[PDB]
Amino acid sequence: EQANDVRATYHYYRPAQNNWDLGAPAVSAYCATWDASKPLSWRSKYGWTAFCGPAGPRGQAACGKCLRVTNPATGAQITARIVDQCANGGLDLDWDTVFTKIDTNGIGYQQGHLNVNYQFVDCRD
C-alpha cells in the first residue's frame, strides 16, 4: 500500500487548456465518466493522476480514492486523485498540481525526473 524511492517525471499533452477533460477524444480515462463531470474548482483543487507505480494495483476500486505524495527533498507533501493509468509510466496530470508545488527550488523541473514517495489515501471532499 506504500511506496518510496520511485523516480517520478511529468508530461503534458492536453491539460486544463481543453479543461483537461478526461473525455477528450485521445485520452478517455477510467473515471472520466464520473469526474470529468465535476466542475472546475474541485477538479483543479484536488489533483487527479493515475493508479500505477511498482507497487500500486488499484483500478476498479480506485475510481473514487485519493493518493498522498511526499517529497523528502523539501519535506513538502500534497494529495492527488486516482483516475487513469500510466501511458507514460507514472503520474502525468501534474505540471500545476503536485510536482510544481512540491518543487520549491525547481531542481526537478530543470532536470526532468525526481525521487518521491507516496501512499494511498481517502479524499474527504
Domain of 6, CATH number, reads 2.40.40.10
Number of Cβ within a 10 Å radius of residue 115:
13
How far apart CA 69 and CA 77 sit, in angstroms, is: 6
> Would residue 112 be called left, alpha or beta, if left means φ above 0 and alpha means ψ between -120 and 50 degrees?
left
Instruction: Give, as one character, the DSSP assignment of residue 44.
Output: H
DSSP 8-state symbol, 67: E
Alpha-carbon distances of 46 from 14, 42, 67, 112, rounded to whole Å: 18, 6, 10, 23
Number of domains forming the structure of the chain: 1
Enter the DSSP assignment of 1: -
Question: Which stretches of the chain are assigned E, i.e. beta strand?
Answer: 2-9, 49-50, 66-71, 76-84, 113-121
Parallel/antiparallel/unpaired status of strands 49-50 and 66-71: unpaired
Contact 116, 70 (CB under 8 A): yes
Which distant-in-sequence residues (6+ apart) come within 8 Å of 109 by Cβ?
10, 99, 100, 103
Sheet holding 2-9, edge to edge: 2-9, 113-121, 66-71, 76-84, 49-50
* Cβ neighbour number for residue 88 with a 10 Å cutoff: 13
d(CA 118, CA 5): 9
Residue 24 structural domain: 1-125
